[PDB]
Design a protein around this nucleic acid. Structure first.
Ligand SMILES: *P(=O)(O)OC[C@H]1O[C@@H](n2cnc3c(N)ncnc32)[C@H](O)[C@@H]1O
Length: 642
DNA sequence: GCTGATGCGTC
DNA sequence: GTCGGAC
DNA sequence: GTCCGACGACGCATCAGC
């Protein structure tokens, strides 16, 4: 209809035709998407966000079906299917430079304003573009903006950054109302709607259920739920939602799903898009569990297995009928070129009767000389793409723990008891190359506890716990976190805690805007009587605790750092703090840092020590900096990881 | 042709 | 990756 | 329990700057 600026997709009794802000066949205006983001961000109830997005999507289906795919990608802040590897190459650095040039302001003024407001979108929105003529360019369209994002991502090579900035400046010149806010957030990778993949899928299945695609215009059926009771409508939308969710979890690729959805409908979708080797799928995840008693409470009387939780990276290995092999990451990225050693070993791990499979494994760095597992840090030094087999320096051992597909059979609906038996019988172990995850089938608390201790002694993070027959399938759509993860450092009073000094604070972004979002911490070097930065910290405190931190550190702000505080290459804090507050901090491991100075020279000549997965536990009101954990104590903790 | 800063992915 | 907030 | 977005260390790949 008329004037996107007034578009209200949160409206009660939203009518997909009469309440749209564009006419049939027209391109969806980007302002329509921006206004939808505004109405989503204004509320906290996830179900209300879904309804609002569904309203937009229903208008897109009814009026401009070719724009459904770009509108969906804009709402997820994706560029396309993950296995295609498109990357903007734009962070806050490029973005802030483009905003400075677009608005004619100094880069430093823009950087300072972004940090104080905690959002680059607000800076871009509230400053005019000095490249704008008297008469604006035509309004942005959803598909136009999406295509420009893709243009940015495809620019490569020398002088490519300047070309990316030119595209961004062009977008800002054409923005109206709130559009610049969401372009900027999207480019920075921080859309921060409160609505993401699961809510987008729920909105999509609701939208195509209520307003079916493919109708002759004007659509005879704009609300297919209106003839049902509230109860019947809810059950129906839940069923339709699960059809979409389960297909997506097997084929998480909107380029494949959306054309089928528009042509054949949601009910026929599983017939056209099915799990198959060569198409990455969503992996099964794990829920953190803070004790053995919590495990037994979660699984009740269902038999379960405990497995070592190996410290590497996930590798989803696909063997296609015909011999081709592909390897994908946890997030559906193509890692095939990264593992020529693994690909060459596939004939060695599968019996000759296996014609196709999808394996779920952990790739762990392996020292062939000493025949033992190596830390994650070592694994991350492998090259990432177009790697040749002879050039591999860090060997990998695969620890296999699941089987999702075998000889043409999808196993997603099969219980782990059967998947595991098929894994054990059709694949071959080779020490230090391909091994089944160490496992224990028991319900005895004393055995589980001992097994947890042994997993740590054997260079693992803890245990994974999985039911064998009750709710034991690989249906991510039913429950994405169907497994449990049990780590020692989850236990209170157990694991490595340090008492560290707060030496700086960083202004918060997003949910943390208007206060501190992070802090710089330091250990005390006895030998030089200096405080050495050891890590940053940004999780572990409640919202109330964070407000107390803000009020207790405000009096410690210094304009300039103390000469006995050393941070070297760490990110300079927005506010320096007089060393006084001491906090108890927990971590999973200690790592060798190329940047932090803490304990430098005590374990390595060039590298200090930092914390893996640090989190705030509590303030140490009874400690001053002189009694904080020493750099020598940090080195001793690092060494005993062996 | 090299180095550092930036981006993005891994955990 | 950990964590807490909102539902 | 689910979903989400605050925030963590770290390393390769890339490209601006030299
Ligand atoms: P996150 O800490 O949420 O844990 C899940 C990941 O752990 C890895 N992993 C290692 N060993 C296993 C076993 N035995 N089973 C399942 N997952 C395991 C995977 O890479 C998961 O992504």
């Amino acid at each position: 209809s008329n004037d996107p600026s007034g578009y209200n997709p949160a409206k009660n009794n939203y009518h997909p035709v009469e309440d749209a802000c564009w006419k049939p066949g027209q391109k969806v205006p980007y302002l329509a998407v921006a206004r939808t983001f505004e109405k989503i961000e204004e509320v906290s109830a996830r179900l209300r966000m879904v309804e609002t997005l569904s309203n937009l999507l229903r208008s897109v289906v009814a009026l401009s079906p070719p724009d459904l795919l770009p509108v969906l990608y804009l709402s997820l802040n994706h560029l396309g299917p993950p296995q295609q590897g498109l990357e903007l190459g734009v962070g806050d650095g490029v973005l802030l430079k483009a905003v400075a040039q677009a608005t004619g302001r100094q880069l430093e003024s823009v950087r300072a304003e972004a940090a104080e407001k905690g959002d680059v979108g607000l800076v871009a929105e509230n400053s005019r573009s000095t490249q704008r003529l008297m008469l604006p360019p035509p309004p942005l369209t959803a598909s136009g903006v999406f295509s420009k994002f893709r243009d940015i991502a495809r620019l490569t090579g020398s002088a490519s950054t300047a070309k990316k900035i030119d595209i961004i400046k062009g977008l800002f010149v054409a923005c109206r109302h709130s559009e610049a806010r969401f372009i900027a957030r999207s480019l920075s990778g921080r859309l921060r709607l409160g609505l993401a993949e699961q809510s987008v899928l729920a909105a999509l299945s609701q939208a195509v259920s209520l307003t079916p695609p493919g109708q002759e215009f004007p659509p005879a059926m704009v609300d297919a739920g209106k003839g049902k009771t509230a109860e019947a409508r809810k059950t129906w939308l839940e069923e339709q939602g699960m059809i979409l969710k389960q297909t997506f979890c097997e084929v998480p690729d909107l380029d494949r799903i959306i054309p089928v959805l528009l042509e054949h409908g949601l009910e026929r979708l599983p017939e056209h898009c099915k799990l198959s080797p060569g198409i990455p799928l969503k992996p099964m995840l794990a829920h953190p569990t803070r004790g053995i008693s919590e495990v037994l409470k979660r699984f009740e009387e269902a038999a379960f297995t405990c497995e070592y939780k190996y410290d590497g990276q996930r590798a989803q290995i696909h063997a296609l009928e015909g011999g081709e092999v592909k390897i994908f990451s946890r997030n559906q990225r193509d890692n095939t070129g990264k593992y020529p050693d693994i690909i060459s070993r596939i004939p060695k791990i599968k019996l000759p009767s296996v014609t196709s499979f999808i394996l779920d494994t952990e790739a762990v760095a392996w020292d062939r000389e000493k025949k033992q597992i190596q830390p994650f840090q070592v694994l991350t030094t492998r090259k990432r793409k177009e790697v040749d087999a002879s050039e591999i320096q860090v060997q990998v051992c695969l620890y296999a723990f699941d089987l999702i597909y075998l000889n043409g059979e999808s196993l997603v609906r099969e219980p782990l008891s059967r998947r595991r038996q098929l894994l054990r019988e059709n694949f071959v172990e080779t020490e230090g190359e391909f091994v089944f995850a160490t496992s224990l089938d028991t319900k005895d608390i004393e055995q589980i506890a001992e097994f947890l201790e042994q997993s740590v002694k054997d260079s693992c993070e803890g245990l994974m716990v999985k039911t064998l027959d009750v709710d034991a399938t690989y249906e991510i759509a039913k429950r994405s976190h169907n497994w449990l993860k049990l780590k020692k450092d989850y236990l209170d009073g157990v694991g490595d805690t340090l008492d560290l000094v707060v030496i700086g604070a960083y202004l918060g972004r997003g949910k943390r805007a208007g206060r501190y979002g992070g802090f710089l911490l330091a250990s005390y070097d006895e030998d030089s009587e200096e405080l050495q930065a050891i890590c940053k910290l940004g999780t572990g405190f409640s919202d109330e605790e964070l407000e107390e931190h803000h009020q207790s550190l405000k009096a410690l702000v210094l304009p300039s750092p103390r000469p006995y505080v050393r941070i070297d290459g760490a990110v300079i804090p927005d506010h320096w703090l007089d060393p006084s507050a001491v906090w108890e901090v927990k971590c999973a491991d200690l790592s060798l840092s190329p940047i932090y100075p803490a304990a430098r020279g005590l374990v390595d000549s060039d590298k200090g020590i930092s914390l893996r997965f640090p989190r705030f536990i509590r303030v140490r009101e009874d400690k001053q900096p002189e009694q904080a954990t020493t750099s020598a104590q940090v080195a001793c903790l690092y060494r005993k990881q062996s």
